[PDB]
Amino acid sequence: RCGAGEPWGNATNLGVPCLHWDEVPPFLERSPPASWAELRGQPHNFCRSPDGAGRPWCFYRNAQGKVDWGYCDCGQG
């Protein structure tokens, strides 16, 4: 039950949980496609959509200690 454009919430697409936007390390492993400082979900974690294509995505933190970003479509990655 995953339509494109609809985020899973706190999981990059359908995999790794979204870390908090203010908890994103200044030295990041992935480069973000857009300036997300205005996603303004800093206090919390939840997919955001900087892309005018209606494509939500968040930063996921995995058990490797990594924090990267992924599209939240639950089937578009």
From Swiss-Prot:
Disulfide bond annotation, renumbered to this chain: 2-74, 18-58, 47-72
Subcellular compartments: Secreted
Highest taxon listed in the record's lineage: Eukaryota
Sugar-bearing residue positions: 10
Domain Kringle, chain residue ranges per copy: 2-74
Function: Plays a role in neuronal plasticity and the proteolytic action may subserve structural reorganizations associated with learning and memory operations.
Family: Belongs to the peptidase S1 family.
Name of the protein in question: Neurotrypsin
Taxonomic lineage: Eukaryota, Metazoa, Chordata, Craniata, Vertebrata
Residues of the full protein shown: 84 to 160 of 761
